Design a protein around this ligand. Structure first.
Ligand SMILES: Cc1cc2c(cc1C)N(C[C@H](O)[C@H](O)[C@H](O)COP(=O)(O)O)c1[nH]c(=O)[nH]c(=O)c1N2
Ligand SMILES: Cc1cc2c(cc1C)N(C[C@H](O)[C@H](O)[C@H](O)COP(=O)(O)O)c1[nH]c(=O)[nH]c(=O)c1N2
Ligand SMILES: O=C1C[C@@H](C(=O)O)NC(=O)N1
Ligand SMILES: O=C1C[C@@H](C(=O)O)NC(=O)N1
Lengths: 315, 312
């Protein structure tokens, strides 16, 4: 205290800064995870994994846009065994804490996956982010848009895993939905953080030149990231910050600079995840974001994030 | 070369109209829309009695569009019906009225009054099931049970062709469920996709304060934020609701975005944020731009490419 710091605390762990990759970006392979570990990021998270490996959807399945991105990756991943081995043997925990995202396509699959994480969480401190918002799996709706199904996942994972974990939520657009989602989450004491938000699901981008969609899967429909999602993300962060006071909120969506990171934290974010901008710029972005956030804080006379986290002013 | 749209018996000069809520609250607003180069116009979403709406500030223009929490300010259904019955010049262009009762009971009462005027003048109803800015009223369209009730009661009470203004959906199962409901009501002849993306939050980094007063800063997003969402919704319903027309609304600033909406399946193309920014002279620009694109591609009518977007 009394000195400028970007440090963050979560259940004992101390993080150097609030920044990490958004799940799915620069975190699928050992090489990806090494580059994230080597970066100036406060933490990193592994690709949303499934019990068995997946190669994902056919190409093209990612398209960069002026205002962000559209993707239908289809959960390409090396399978849970790979991520667990990485967490257990490979990751350098002296550099930074590690999160793993898990996206079992059924409650049954999720239970089996999280049971395997338990020993490694105990041994190494690996943190779980349960993905309830994957929008690009043909035939599987975003779990988080069904509160009955969501309650089932949270119950079974709480029983099987039995340790503090977090959830990656879809964006909500209705006050009643904020209320219902919070009511479910507030029934699970083991849920200690909420990541707001996953991509804005099932957008469509068309090229006027050739009258053709720009991605191949699902007739061109894909999740939107980047500048498109910033107001949505801030609203979700703030809505859950207020409704779930005993839980932390991680902000994800539209972060390209210190300015957006500042707004996320104002809204209530503990950690700030970076997807599209990281895909564009590479891991050097974390060095830039640390600098830019420090600049804004200096200009406003803040030394720590604790001075302005959740202090957004209403009228 | 032709921008004409022949639907519901009417001949629209071009596909363009205002989005409900933009330049359509007062008599002066409606006159300016009628005098514009738009193919049509729609009245502000109305209630049985007048409303003054939410406290200020409740609108903020952004680089990438707009946030609003207007709260359904309107002069009441009698004013809009009176406009439709006596004032509007039908030889200039057809007229839609948006109605947004806060209960099914209110909606029923309003549409019953429209029946005679539709019959005599041809006024077209758009039923608003997607208002996101009324404190303590969730968007009807996100509750399929409640949506069904509104469509049942309105179908019974109105008993004429009408359309529905839908909230944006983000999930295939929701496209399926919404279409399932809509396809049970033969009188629903058009679907307008989409209303604003509900309950976004804008914060000014300079003063660390939200930009609108209602609902702790939470308001509906319009403009460049919504184009991909709007296109997806237009196309989803175009394919799932073949017995219905689809109107496109969201992120139209130019002929190019209009072209995309029509390629996705749109019959009419509504303009909100860009019209709020530029005024009714935008419609002159849009007609020229769409014309130019059609010329470049060799299309003589909108029918030649409506809903003909190509997939891989
Ligand atoms: C290429 C790619 C791949 C993925 C994603 C995104 C992109 C662009 N996203 C969503 C991501 O974590 C994030 O929530 C959104 O992209 C919004 O953040 P940005 O606006 O992109 O920073 C994602 N989310 C998740 O929980 N698990 C995943 O495996 C993926 N995969
Ligand atoms: C100031 C203002 C007022 C309203 C709106 C918007 C704005 C900006 N919108 C939503 C509008 O009709 C449209 O669906 C969205 O704004 C998306 O279109 P744009 O991206 O803005 O072109 C709206 N929609 C509706 O059905 N009834 C209404 O009364 C209003 N009112
Ligand atoms: O959670 C997810 C899954 C990912 C993918 O498709 O792999 N894409 C996304 O946008 N979010
Ligand atoms: O349907 C509506 C209602 C309007 C308002 O708040 O008056 N604003 C909107 O964005 N959509």
């Amino acid at each position: 205290p009394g000195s400028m710091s970007l440090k963050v605390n979560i259940l004992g762990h101390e993080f150097s800064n609030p920044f990490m990759n958004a799940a799915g970006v620069l975190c699928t392979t050992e090489e990806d995870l090494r580059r994230m570990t080597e970066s100036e990021s406060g933490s990193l998270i592994g690709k949303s994994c499934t019990l068995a490996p997946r190669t994902g959807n056919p190409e093209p399945r990612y398209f960069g846009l002026p205002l962000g991105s559209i993707n239908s990756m289809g959960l390409p991943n090396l399978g849970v065994d790979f991520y667990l081995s990485y967490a257990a043997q490979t990751h350098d925990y002296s550099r930074k804490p590690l999160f793993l995202s898990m996206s079992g396509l059924s409650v049954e699959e999720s239970v089996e996956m999280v049971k395997k994480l338990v020993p490694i969480t105990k041994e190494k401190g690996t943190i779980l982010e349960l993905n309830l918002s994957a929008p690009n799996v043909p035939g599987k709706p975003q779990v988080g848009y069904d509160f009955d199904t969501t309650r089932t996942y949270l119950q079974k994972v709480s029983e099987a895993y039995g340790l503090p974990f977090g959830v990656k939520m879809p964006p909500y657009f209705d006050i009643a939905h904020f209320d219902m989602a919070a009511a479910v989450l507030n029934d699970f004491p083991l849920v200690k953080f909420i990541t707001c938000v996953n991509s804005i699901g099932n957008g469509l981008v068309i090229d006027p030149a050739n009258e053709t969609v720009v991605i191949k899967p699902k007739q061109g429909f894909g999740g939107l990231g980047g500048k498109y999602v910033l107001p949505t993300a801030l609203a979700n962060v703030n809505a859950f910050f207020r409704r779930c006071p005993d839980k932390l909120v991680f902000g994800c969506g539209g972060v390209y600079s210190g300015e957006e990171a500042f707004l996320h934290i104002l809204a209530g974010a503990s950690m700030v995840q970076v997807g599209t901008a990281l895909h564009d710029e590479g891991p050097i972005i974390f060095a830039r974001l640390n600098k830019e956030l420090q600049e804004i804080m200096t200009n406003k006379g803040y030394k720590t994030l604790d001075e302005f986290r959740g202090r957004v002013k209403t009228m």
